[PDB]
Amino acid sequence: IESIIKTATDTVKSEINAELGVVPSLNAVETGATSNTEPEEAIQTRTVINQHGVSETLVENFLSRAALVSKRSFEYKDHTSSTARADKNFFKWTINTRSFVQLRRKLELFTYLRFDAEITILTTVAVNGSGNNTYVGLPDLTLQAMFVPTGALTPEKQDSFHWQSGSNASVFFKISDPPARITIPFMCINSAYSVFYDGFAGFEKNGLYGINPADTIGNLCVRIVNEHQPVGFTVTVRVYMKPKHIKAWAPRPPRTLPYMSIANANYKGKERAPNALSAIIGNRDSVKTMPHNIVN
């Protein structure tokens, strides 16, 4: 039944029981219900007034933490002789929560999630080695982070006119300023994000499995506004996400085997236990062997 729970439940003292027809310790697992055997019915207890709070396990508290979701390093320099695949003073990132495993596993503890997302961008800069074998100092550069909806037109170069950002939300920030922060609303076309999706997002048979683009927040396009300096630098941008105003539905078995890809739940497991395909828990000598037995 629904009730407001702020502290752990109290224990009431209990006496001897010798009653026919009453077996609180016996249960029927086959029904799918969890055993209702209380400590008062299993042993003789005292009275305990429990003042232990339960607020730290609140779903909001459990998930509302800034977790690293993106890390991208790129060279800030003249990119005339750079390869096509290189990030020429700017990068684009399709936003996802599946690249860093701690937050991914925490989110995947649930089937459905609804939250707004606080986004924090932290920038660091270093002077390139083997480009100029000397140090002069770190410039205070200005960066532009533009939100572009998934599939929409992204900038093709650092000085592209697409950065004019007529309607796209853009944030300009300096390396010397505190990390930039913006709140993105819950943007799913459905009432909740689908953490897991058992289907195909296309009307033909060649669409991606387990991927619902309605659950992709969008694209983040980050550029250095400053034109290049005579010497080269390496700029690393870290994007952190913190869910807030969270609602969660249908908890799931936690991930055990290591993640393989950000696109699927494919599994291989470790070579040996723990967290191997044939053995999740580490082995002991026998079911009669106590691993950390106290011996005096």
């Binding site: 752990a8 697992v29 730290e56 695949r85 996802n96 495993v101 993640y259």
Partner: protein
């Protein structure tokens, strides 16, 4: 003792489950040791392409 007739299986299995009661509580959240990575996952780079 475990006592079975000859027609039944002479070895029988038990399944053990564990749960916490409602007097249970947790404190001092920390990163779970049960998951970790030493490298970027597959297709993680493709999100930047």
């Amino acid at each position: 003792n475990l006592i079975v007739p000859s027609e039944s299986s002479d070895t029988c299995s038990l399944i053990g489950f564990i749960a916490a009661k409602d007097d249970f509580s947790l404190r001092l959240m920390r990163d779970s040791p049960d998951i970790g990575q030493l490298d970027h996952l597959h297709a993680a780079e493709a999100a930047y392409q």
